[PDB]
Structures are given as structure tokens and as C-alpha cells.
A paper describes a structure:
TagI belongs to the recently characterized SRA-HNH family of modification-dependent restriction endonucleases (REases) that also includes ScoA3IV (Sco5333) and TbiR51I (Tbis1). The SRA-HNH REases are characterized by the presence of an SRA (SET and RING finger associated) domain at the N-terminus and an HNH (histidine-asparagine-histidine) domain at the C-terminus. Our data show that TagI is a member of the NTP-independent dimeric REases that cleave DNA at a distance from the modified cytosine base. We attribute the modification specificity to the SRA domains, and the RYN/RY specificity to the HNH-domain dimer.
The crystals diffracted to 2.9 Å resolution, belonged to space group P4(1)2(1)2 and contained a single TagI protomer in the asymmetric unit. As predicted by the analysis of the amino acid sequence, TagI consists of an N-terminal SRA domain and a C-terminal HNH domain. The linker that connects the domains (residues 168–192) is not represented by electron density in the crystals, presumably due to disorder. TagI crystals contained a dimer located on a crystallographic two-fold axis and mediated by the interactions between the HNH domains. The TagI SRA domain can be described, similarly to the prototypical UHRF1 SRA domain, as a distorted β barrel, which unlike perfect β-barrels has a ‘gap’, i.e. adjacent strands that should, but do not actually engage in main chain hydrogen bonding interactions. In the case of TagI (and in UHRF1), the walls of the pocket for the flipped base are built from tyrosine residues, Tyr55 and Tyr67. The TagI HNH domain is built around the core ββα-Me motif of HNH endonucleases. The TagI HNH domain is organized around two divalent metal cations, a structural Zn2+ ion and a catalytic divalent metal ion. The identity of the latter ion in the crystal is uncertain, but we tentatively interpret it as a Na+ ion. The structural Zn2+ ion in TagI is coordinated by three cysteines, presumably in the thiolate form, and an aspartate.
Numbering used by the authors:
A (entry chain A), B (entry chain A): 2 to 167, 193 to 311
Write the structure that this text describes.
């Protein structure tokens, strides 16, 4: 059974070569035998195979314009209808872009000349999905195709990505957002984009050398992009009794939206509160 | 006259050494003779000098915990009051973090041992300011100091920075946000953080190889973080008559907030609209 997994695969480093698609499938690199995109709307896309599937595709080594799946005649191999984001591979690729999930590019024999191998399939490491759009198909302008921009991840801490087995844990984010359904714990909204709901996982006690916060569900809030910014730059704090308070003027906003399977560790809350200029004293709210 | 300028300075590459602070000042690297931070709340901070100014400072080469300016007795050289964000250097450093402006680190003789030079002052290239907080001073815990986390920029397109002379133009962003006063052109709000107002500059026709958008004031909108996300992932478009429309359901939101010195080039609007799955036809709104 294939297990969908983001990041490098144990045993198969960047550079690894394979003879055909069944190899790649057995190794755990892709899910599929023919299909270009390994992915699902719910979970994200963990790999793509690039073997000149459309003539819209462009390959610049470190940059890739990848064209999506859908709307081909099985017999003709010619576009007969528009591409959409119901396609799990197309949807999964957008969901990778939004969650910042890295995508294993596996490059194939038949593709663009300088970067493709002469024969077989090489695994060329992880790329980040940056944007997506629709354009007109080159061979048949009356039909729309979906397209993605992919950029090579050179340093994993630099580009902000999340991976399954470590860098920051993908699982942690996915739990917290899943429990809340991408609703901001402060203002209640869900940001709706083309593919679906959108939110940001925001650590309460920051990660790294100085602060040493754990990367876990208890040290994280699901927030909208606006509230993330406020929260990280002294405009919100949370009380011991889980009220959200405007740090700039002292005014109490309202209660934090809680979920029973999501246990916020109050030590981390206290720590975050303690990064403000004047620590809120007893009786402040 | 010193001109405050973000990024590398012509003639002084990373590695450049100098004998004392007056040299650094003449070269154009810093603004000041003693003061650690070159910077202002309005414009941002373009440099810091790191010469063991506080014992709270930590130096890890690629990471730096820098401690801010303020609250010292001129005679004693000991902390006598709390640090605040009225200090132009402290404020400027937060404003650098928010605008994503790179900061020239110049490292000094008296600092942390492995990374400091043996004598003089070396220019160690650009760093990005990532976060800031307040903590207790080591020598006098009853007083608060301001602190910053700085990370070395290795690739300038990767870390998302904006520089004065080119990468993306800092001037372009600064104009657009200045004309609008960090108000979202879609929803009207200003995000207020500790140091002041906050917004995002959002190109209308994206930059780079595929789309080839210009990096100019006419191809950019000032937006709140929430609306930026919607705008880049098929949830908003703008009409020829400058109304904002919800791309998901077709519903018209309201008119775009315009400013007379900010001329949006309608070709770019049309281009952005044309990235949606079905291009809006005549009579759509
Ligand atoms: Na954060
Ligand atoms: Na953008
Ligand atoms: Zn919110
Ligand atoms: Zn807005």
C-alpha cells in the first residue's frame, strides 16, 4: 500500500535513478503508474513526474511551469474540454502551494532536453509550489488548462516548508487546522480561496535557539493571515482564562475559539504574553 | 550627507574591512559614529554594528540575537530605565522586519570571539530581521530591553527581500503603501501592530519568466494580508470600471479604494482577471 508522504523518501536521495514508472512506484516516490500528479485535494500533492506531458510545460531547471491533469481524449490524446480544480491532482497541487508542502519532482526521459536524463527516470529533489493559474492550451486555444510554478527548495528552513518525517512537522499543522476547519481562533473567519479553505498555523511560543518552543499541537493556533501578523508583533495576547486581548490598547476582544481535542498548554501562552514591553499584571482584564 | 539605503553599497562588497567607525560612515555603510543602529521609525533600519554592546547579544554567525538601543546612563553605562519603540533605531528595526528590508551587518572587534575580526570592522553582508520581542536585561533584570532575531540572506530572491538599487524595488512598495497609508484597497482596514501600521504590496500581474509583470507602482495594490491571499488564488478580480468582485460566487464586493497619485494600469488588471478558470464575459457585473 502506498503511503502519501511529503519530503525526501528514506533510501532514495536526490540524484537516484530508476528504469521505469513501476520502479518509482515501488520505491515510494509517486503513487501512480501513468498519471503525472501524485495527489489529492484533501491531503496535498507529494510528487509530480515531468516527461513532456503537455507542450505548455516549460522547464528551466530551478523553475518549472507544470501543466495539470484533465480533459484529454483517451483515444485522440487531444484536449476536448476545460481543466478544473475537481481533479485531485490539480487540487492537491494548489493545496500543496497553500500549506507550503514540498513536492518531489521526478524527471523523465521524454521531456525538455538539457535537464532530462538520456534514459530512465531521475529523482531531482524537492520543489515548492509558488503560484497557479489558468491559461489557454497551445494546441487548442479554445480550452483552458491549469498551470503551476515550481521553485527548487535549496534550504528547507529558508523556504518555510513543512515535511512529514523530520524543519517543521506537517502533521502538527494539519491536525490543528483540521480540528478547527481553517477557522481563525481569534476572529472566527475562514478564508475561502479557489480550491477551498485557507488558514495559517501560528506557534505560540516561537521555535528556535532563543525561545526553544516545541513544534506541537499544544503550542499552535489556527489563525487568519491578519491575526497571525498581529499575534507575532505585539497586538494580541491571550489571558490565563483564554480571552483574546488587544495588547495595544488593553481592550478585551472576546474569548478564544477552543476545540476539545486541541489542548493549548498555558505555559506557552504565558511565555508569549511575556514578550510584550510591559508584562500584563494582575487585574489587567 | 548620508543617504539611507538598503542592500549592498556600490564599491564595498561582503568581506570589506575598515579601521574605525569614521571609515564605515564615509563609505556609506552606517549613518552614525557610535550608535549601534542606523535607522528611523519612518524609513526602516539599513544597518547595525555589532561590537558586544550588550551582554544579552548572542552571535551564531548566520543567526544573531541583537539587543536594541535606549535606557543607559551616559556616565555609568548601566541600564536605568526600560527600552521602548519610540527609539528610532528600535522602531526602524521592526519596520525593516515588517517591510522585509535587508540590514547590513557590520561586525566589530570587541564582540563574540569566533565570528568577530581580530581588529577593525568587517562588513559581513545582508541579514533579514525575522522577529522581535522584549526580555529582561541580564545585568539588571528589573529593566526590559528590546531584541531582534537576524538571519543571513544567502539568496535575495529566495528570502523575499526588497532593496533600493537593483530582486524587487523597495521604492515601489514604499510609494504605494505611503499613498494609501497602509489601507487595504479592498476592505479598507489598516492592520495596527506594535510599531505602527502594516500592509502588503501585491503585484497585479505577477513578476517573473512566465507572466513578465513590471515591478512598478501601476502594477501593485496595497492590501491587508487576508485580501492578498484571496487576490493571488482566484477569490477576487477587479473590473475595467474598478469594482472588486468575488470570483468564487460572482458577487460584487464594492469599489476599489483609489488614490490620485496611484495610477493602476488597466492592462495588468485585465491580465490578472484572465488567470481565472472562466474569464468573466461581457455583462458579468
Ligand atoms: Na509564528
Ligand atoms: Na503577489
Ligand atoms: Zn482572524
Ligand atoms: Zn483587506
Amino acid at each position: 500500500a502506498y503511503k502519501r508522504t511529503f519530503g525526501h523518501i528514506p533510501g532514495h536521495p536526490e540524484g537516484s535513478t530508476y528504469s521505469n514508472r513501476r520502479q518509482v512506484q515501488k520505491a515510494g516516490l509517486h503513487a501512480h503508474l501513468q498519471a503525472g500528479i501524485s495527489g489529492t485535494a484533501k491531503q496535498g500533492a507529494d510528487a509530480i513526474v515531468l516527461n513532456g506531458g503537455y507542450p505548455d510545460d516549460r522547464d528551466y531547471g530551478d523553475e518549472i511551469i507544470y501543466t495539470g491533469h484533465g480533459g484529454q481524449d483517451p483515444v485522440t490524446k487531444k484536449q476536448i474540454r476545460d481543466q478544473d480544480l475537481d481533479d485531485p491532482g490539480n487540487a492537491g497541487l494548489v493545496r500543496s502551494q497553500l500549506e507550503g508542502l514540498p513536492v518531489r519532482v521526478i524527471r523523465g526521459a521524454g521531456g525538455e532536453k538539457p535537464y532530462s536524463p538520456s534514459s530512465g527516470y531521475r529523482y531531482d529533489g524537492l520543489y515548492k509550489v509558488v503560484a497557479h493559474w489558468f491559461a489557454n492550451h497551445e494546441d487548442a486555444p479554445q480550452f483552458r488548462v491549469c498551470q503551476f510554478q515550481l521553485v527548487k527548495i535549496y534550504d528547507q528552513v529558508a523556504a518555510g516548508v513543512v515535511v512529514d518525517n523530520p524543519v517543521r512537522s506537517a502533521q502538527v499543522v494539519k491536525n490543528v487546522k483540521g480540528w478547527h476547519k481553517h477557522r481563525c481562533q481569534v476572529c472566527g473567519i475562514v478564508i475561502e480561496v479557489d480550491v477551498g479553505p485557507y488558514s495559517q498555523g501560528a506557534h505560540i511560543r516561537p521555535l528556535g535557539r532563543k525561545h526553544g518552543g516545541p513544534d506541537v499541537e499544544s503550542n499552535m493556533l489556527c489563525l487568519c493571515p491578519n491575526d497571525h501578523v498581529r499575534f507575532d508583533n505585539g497586538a494580541l495576547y491571550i489571558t490565563d482564562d483564554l480571552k483574546v486581548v488587544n495588547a495595544l490598547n488593553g481592550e478585551v476582544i472576546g474569548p478564544l475559539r477552543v476545540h476539545p481535542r486541541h489542548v493549548i498548554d498555558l505555559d506557552h501562552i504565558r511565555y508569549h504574553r511575556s514578550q510584550l514591553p510591559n508584562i500584563p499584571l494582575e487585574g489587567s482584564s
